[PDB]
């Protein structure tokens, strides 16, 4: 898709329908939001997006097989759970990488909505990733400058996109969250502090839910209420589409957005803002070595279709 | 196989071919500058029997 | 770069208004028609350097 | 090769280069003369074309 | 970076920091006079040749009669044992 | 045993 | 290999043929033009 | 200030992997061939053959020719009583002095 | 002292490279005033017009 | 030249001076720019009429049309700037420097 | 490292154009140049004078 | 403007008919060969920028680059030769038409002229 | 001349398409072959220059330099193998290509018949040198050194470009042959004086002249070993070659305008050698010694006597070889100790005997031990200056003394004394390093046998 | 404009030193006024008094430099009795540079200005004698 | 902006320039300039930003003043000559005023001030258009009136342009501002030979267009507007920054790159006209341009600045957009010096 296709007559609004809606399911750690999101997608026919992980970009490109952490992400969630105040900057590096992954996820979702026309259900989003960073700063895990840089990156990236039509919040109390985490069994999850979960909940209810409520409907559900998928789907169906800026958009603006989301590098252009924070800054020698390792990886040396090492042929005529 | 040998050591003929071609190019320029074959006031001589040119 | 496409294609697009001795509507003469005609006829193809 | 070959080649090269120098100086002089007189094909700045002038009977007899 | 020679010390605090940098006592440390010759804060060590230094003392660098970490004279190359000698003479 | 490559400080001057 | 099909995959074939054809036409026109110019130059210059 | 690799340790001595190293690369076979190439072409060819080539380079500086011509000229000069060397590099007859 | 520092590392460098570079730096600061006000450079345009009209008549 | 031509040219000069010497409002600068267009209209009209350049009597009209087009442009830019800043002050245009 | 740095790197940064530095720099930079120029010029002119009057002996001075 | 205003110059004409009287540039002209070299380099750079094998990807693409460069270069060289021939022709004609402005200085031999000798001592 | 140029060009595709394990091997092989081919050019005629074509020619001045460059390339590759062994294949090929481009440019410079073509190529040499210094330098001062070198050379060259175009406009041709046969004396007008300055200053900058030599220490010290090799072996001689060529049309104004530069160089040799005496960096010492030895050549060129020119050519070749060798030895020591401080490593003679012998021979050549070509050139220049003025012998002899002093001082400080105890990484000398030193020394000693080849066209 | 340069040039070198200096002073003052106008426009003076002060300072400095240059050059030519030496202009230029340094109350500025100004003035004299054309009339 | 509308506006800008280069009537040339301005403002403000609006306003103001002065000069020439053809102007005052106006349109100093500001405000594409295509029409008008152009005034403006461009470029850190000041200097170089030989100006203009096209396209491909943002490029795409190094060296003019051709030919023509001081000063001042080019090359490719962790994600994805002309433009802007004798074709 390009300017020519828009000139030829390809209009996104023609494909878009009432079903076409961006629904984000948000909540605290281990709130069971993923199950509800899947149920919503199945009962609305929408495309569910699993929550963006460290190797989400690895799935989108190449063979989908997650690449080495040193080559893709250079951050560990498990390390953050074990040591939230490490001197390696793993906390903020992880948070920034997650934001970049979620920015890519939101763009990947929008592109699906503007090409196929099918709605999308996403587990959290960029508009919700700030909660974890705020929690980390409250706990003292990260420094203030990290928060400042994250705000800088967000303000220059998120603005280009459109907020979700429906914001579903699964409200699970912190004690129940602790109980589930203990039942979950993950030792790193067990190491999660209760204060961190409380900060996440506070950030949600005091910043995210009101601001999203201004933009669109916020269908807050209890854990018991979320179990009733039928009710959740019905409530979303009965939400006025007026909520959200999508009714205020047209084929021209949709064309701009579609061109934006297609170019993933353009989407992630400002994720690498040249602010030198020790947590994110990577030395030149290490950068060169890691990039050389990345290029050595099969399928990454040349552009897709020209990597003969993976089986591509006819390159002499390609 | 000799094929494998030339397959990996073909680049070993570039510069020798370069020298051969350069000798040819130098010879070509000399041919273009044959305007005083036996017109110098120092080496002017009659062509010997069965001599096309002095190549000078 | 005066790409004289007018002369190449033999099309008059602005040469009609270049001088006042050119044909004006209803053959209305210019105030200095004679003088301009004399000057142009004198300086036709002799070059700007010589015409000066 | 023989020394006479290089001798003749040097003579030819000298002739070519000297003729080039003569032509370059000649060109500079010709260009200066043409640009100072406008009597040559070069530096012929355009003038008004006499074809544009209309000699058809005007309105006022004294043109 | 801070372990590199700097400008002429002006405040006594600068002098103490320079003395610490060169591993010299604050009392002993003496910068070259601020004549604008580019000496900076480098210590003005006594102008005595390496030959004068005790030949029986165990030096880290025996041929140069120097110790590791010891402040090095500005004109050490001139005052090496192979060059100009400032040792006392009988007459 | 590595060529000097600009640190954060060197880039900050730009 | 790739999860998503390459935007290239098999050679375009149509575009490849068009490129070959354009290059061949350029060569044919160039050679014929040079031949014509040689003949015309000889004709005009004995 | 930056997450960078620690300084690479002192360059691994090529002797460590293979005691017979000759320097050059790390692979022993390619080291052997590189040393053979450098020594054969560098010493056996240029240094020897080219030295012989420039040693027997044909005299185009006209040194022997100059000496022989000088001998002939000296013979003629002495035989005819003419001075061995004149005082004018060009004949005054063809010099139209102002 | 006299050769190595006084001349080579001090005066010779001060006489040619250092001086020229410092002059260039000051000129760069002057040219890139970084004010960016239409009023000022348009007044400069007016001054230029007047000066050109007087000097080149 | 007749004194009327001198006065019109002087009017153009005065309007140019006012335009180049801004004070506060960008609107005032646009007024000066349009005044200059008026003065040029008057000058060209008088010249064409006196010379009886019949075929060139359309030049002032074309000048007028294009003049008002470039003005429509100026006004559109002024309102964009005012809506962004709040006033049409020339000092507001300061984000871009050098 | 400090010694090597101070001997070369820190020389200019601490340098100040004091009257002493300026005077010494001038008298040891251009002083010797002017002195040698004067000496050599005088010698050359003397030899040229002798050449002009033919007094200078060049009986076997055929290599120069 | 030099020859931009030459008499009889048809506007927007790349190669006038009179150029055909001049010898056509040889298809093995070294300048044309350099043009083809530039085309091949362009192909290599295009491959490099698009992260595809520099020396093998899109052989048709590189071939078209070379062909386009050579094809346009042939006419470029022909026009260049035409313009230089125009220069020489006009200069010679002007010298012929203005003999007084281009006199023939008396040719004197070195034995006659006097050049001051500057001894190198 | 294309018999040399075309293979040099063909080196580039070979290096780019050579296997990662064969890059150095192929490059060295064919570079040595190209040097062998270039050896044919040494058969210069007695009077006429070898005018191969309208564009390329050679004489007894150009041919030794051409052979020197073609011979220097393989040794540069051999030296560069060590430090550029952890580099990626693409960057290693890039370095090799930069070296090949530099060699090609230098060949064309030394063979160019047209003065403006020589200017173009001799200023084209800056780009590869700048890239080599700034990209593959080891210190942080490499950027400033590259800036200094580039700006010094350009500030010298641009007035030369203007002057050359002026000469082309006035004389009508810049071909060396025509410029020499149609030579016309220059008057003493200020215009002629400034033309002479424009024609001389660029080459004065190229071969370090006291006052304009500040770029050389930085460049040589910061640049990688190969870059320093070319910088001190050919790039400096570029100035001498250009000056000797251009002085043909700069007479008799040279007689009046030489005194400033002559005195500057005659005092500069002493000053720079004294600076060498009190240096703490090995590479800096080598660079300053180069400055003095090149000031000798500057004097020789300015005097314009035949003996001076012969000695200048011989000294240029000799210094190229010696300085390259000295930098290579310093590079080996630096690679082992990872520092350029001269006093850091001591008593290396005990640990590395053969490298110490190489050091001894190189230092002997540096101090012009008879009958080395170094001494031949130095003595010829000294005799020419003595003919110019008898007072010159004072400074010349003092400079000889200081050169001997600092060379032996370098040898004693590095290859003598008590070994440094803590330095334990001094491994045995590699075969490649010894071969490099041999390929630097043996040609010079052989050249002493037949000095006529490197004695220039005035022999 | 060109009339001021005419005034300076018409006065023969090494003659009418007072008049020569007067003409040079007028030229320098005009240049100072131009610089003052440009400075005031680009760098707005806070007060009209500040603008007057800046204009006066720049004009006085430039005029003083011009007066010193003219007087020094003419007097040097008179004493040496050689009106065609570039050294006269060089001495005048260095004197003007020293005056600039005094006006800026900076010895380094004065020294550098002396060197550069003296060189440029000598070059101007050399061009006046040889015929160097800064803005050559198109001739080809 | 709808793509059809954008294409129409671009074609309108091109048509204005073509009218300026095709017309023989002064009024039509002024009309073409007005069309260029009218269709240029929206292109400058394609991406609505306060900085973009400020840049558009400043550009409009400057170009409007220039057009006013141009039409005034045309009217004065009509008054004193009764001529509309674009030939030798017959009034000196009109000639001076027209020169001022056309220089302001070009951006020659002291009318350079607007160029860096507008270039920084507008996007990289708009910057490319402003610094390459918008330079054609005023240069064409100047070339047609070169005979009447006062050599002194034009030479002063050109030399000041070179000096000011170099100085401004030395202090800038934003890539767009560096490009703008370098453009000012190159325009000074172009207009210096305008009174002497117009074909050399055409040559310099073509080389400048190729170089600026290559540089702007490389910046767009790297999506960098500051020195640090460009420094990060080495980690992702080293080829782009290395080619940028080559193009920067060409912009400096260092032989044997293409950038030497225009300077070489310009110096040749100026020396033929007995002007020696002016070209010497021109080259010596272009050294400053070389300095800031070298600084940019240092930061971009000659040395390696620190990168960020998020670069790993960008490594995986490949640029979708493909600028077809970029390779040819790089080649033509780097390796064309062996092809100077093709200068005759311009005549």
Coordinates of C-alpha atoms in Angstrom, one line a residue, chain L residues 7-120:
Chain L
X7 CA 23.7 32.3 -35.3
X8 CA 21.6 29.5 -36.7
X9 CA 21.4 27.5 -33.5
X10 CA 18.1 25.7 -33.4
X11 CA 16.7 26.0 -29.9
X12 CA 16.5 22.8 -27.7
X13 CA 18.5 20.8 -30.2
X14 CA 20.8 18.2 -28.6
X15 CA 22.6 17.3 -31.9
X16 CA 22.2 19.4 -35.0
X17 CA 22.5 17.8 -38.4
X18 CA 25.9 19.4 -39.0
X19 CA 27.3 17.2 -36.2
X20 CA 26.8 14.1 -38.5
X21 CA 29.6 15.5 -40.6
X22 CA 31.9 14.9 -37.6
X23 CA 33.2 11.3 -36.9
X24 CA 30.9 9.4 -34.5
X25 CA 32.4 8.5 -31.2
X26 CA 33.6 4.9 -31.2
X27 CA 31.7 2.4 -29.2
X28 CA 35.0 1.4 -27.6
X29 CA 35.8 5.0 -26.7
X30 CA 37.5 5.1 -23.3
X31 CA 35.2 7.9 -22.1
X32 CA 32.2 5.7 -23.0
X33 CA 33.9 2.8 -21.1
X34 CA 34.2 5.0 -18.1
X35 CA 30.5 5.8 -18.4
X36 CA 29.8 2.1 -18.3
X37 CA 32.0 1.8 -15.3
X38 CA 30.0 4.5 -13.6
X39 CA 26.8 2.6 -14.4
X40 CA 28.1 -0.7 -13.0
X41 CA 29.2 1.2 -9.8
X42 CA 25.7 2.6 -9.6
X43 CA 24.3 -0.9 -9.8
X44 CA 26.6 -2.1 -7.0
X45 CA 25.6 0.9 -4.8
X46 CA 21.9 0.2 -5.4
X47 CA 22.5 -3.4 -4.3
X48 CA 24.4 -2.3 -1.2
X49 CA 21.8 0.2 -0.1
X50 CA 19.0 -2.4 -0.5
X51 CA 20.8 -5.0 1.6
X52 CA 21.1 -7.5 -1.2
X53 CA 24.2 -9.3 -2.6
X54 CA 26.3 -6.5 -4.1
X55 CA 28.0 -8.4 -6.9
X56 CA 25.2 -10.8 -7.8
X57 CA 21.7 -9.5 -6.8
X58 CA 19.7 -8.3 -9.8
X59 CA 22.0 -9.0 -12.7
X60 CA 19.3 -7.6 -15.0
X61 CA 19.2 -4.4 -12.8
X62 CA 23.0 -3.9 -13.1
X63 CA 22.9 -4.7 -16.8
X64 CA 20.2 -2.0 -17.3
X65 CA 22.3 0.5 -15.3
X66 CA 25.3 -0.2 -17.6
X67 CA 23.2 -0.1 -20.8
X68 CA 21.5 3.2 -19.8
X69 CA 24.8 4.8 -18.9
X70 CA 26.6 3.8 -22.1
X71 CA 23.6 4.6 -24.3
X72 CA 23.2 8.2 -22.9
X73 CA 27.0 8.6 -22.8
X74 CA 27.3 7.9 -26.5
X75 CA 25.1 10.9 -27.4
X76 CA 26.7 13.0 -24.7
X77 CA 30.1 12.4 -26.2
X78 CA 28.8 13.1 -29.7
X79 CA 27.4 16.5 -28.5
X80 CA 30.6 17.3 -26.7
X81 CA 32.6 16.6 -29.8
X82 CA 30.2 18.7 -31.8
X83 CA 30.6 21.7 -29.4
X84 CA 34.4 21.5 -29.4
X85 CA 34.4 21.3 -33.2
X86 CA 32.1 24.4 -33.3
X87 CA 34.7 26.1 -31.0
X88 CA 37.6 25.3 -33.3
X89 CA 35.7 26.1 -36.5
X90 CA 34.5 29.5 -35.2
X91 CA 37.9 30.4 -33.8
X92 CA 39.7 29.6 -37.1
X93 CA 37.0 31.5 -39.1
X94 CA 37.4 34.5 -36.9
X95 CA 41.2 34.5 -37.2
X96 CA 40.9 34.2 -41.0
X97 CA 38.3 37.1 -41.2
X98 CA 40.4 39.3 -38.9
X99 CA 44.0 39.0 -40.1
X100 CA 45.2 42.3 -38.7
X101 CA 44.1 41.3 -35.2
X102 CA 46.1 38.0 -35.5
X103 CA 49.5 39.0 -37.1
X104 CA 52.3 36.6 -37.8
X105 CA 55.3 37.7 -35.6
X106 CA 58.7 37.5 -37.3
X107 CA 60.3 34.2 -36.6
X108 CA 63.9 34.7 -35.3
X109 CA 66.3 31.9 -34.4
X110 CA 67.8 31.7 -30.9
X111 CA 71.2 32.7 -32.4
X112 CA 69.6 36.1 -33.2
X113 CA 67.6 36.7 -30.0
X114 CA 69.3 37.7 -26.8
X115 CA 68.3 36.0 -23.5
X116 CA 69.9 37.2 -20.3
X117 CA 71.9 34.5 -18.6
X118 CA 71.2 34.3 -14.9
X119 CA 74.1 32.4 -13.2
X120 CA 73.1 29.9 -10.5

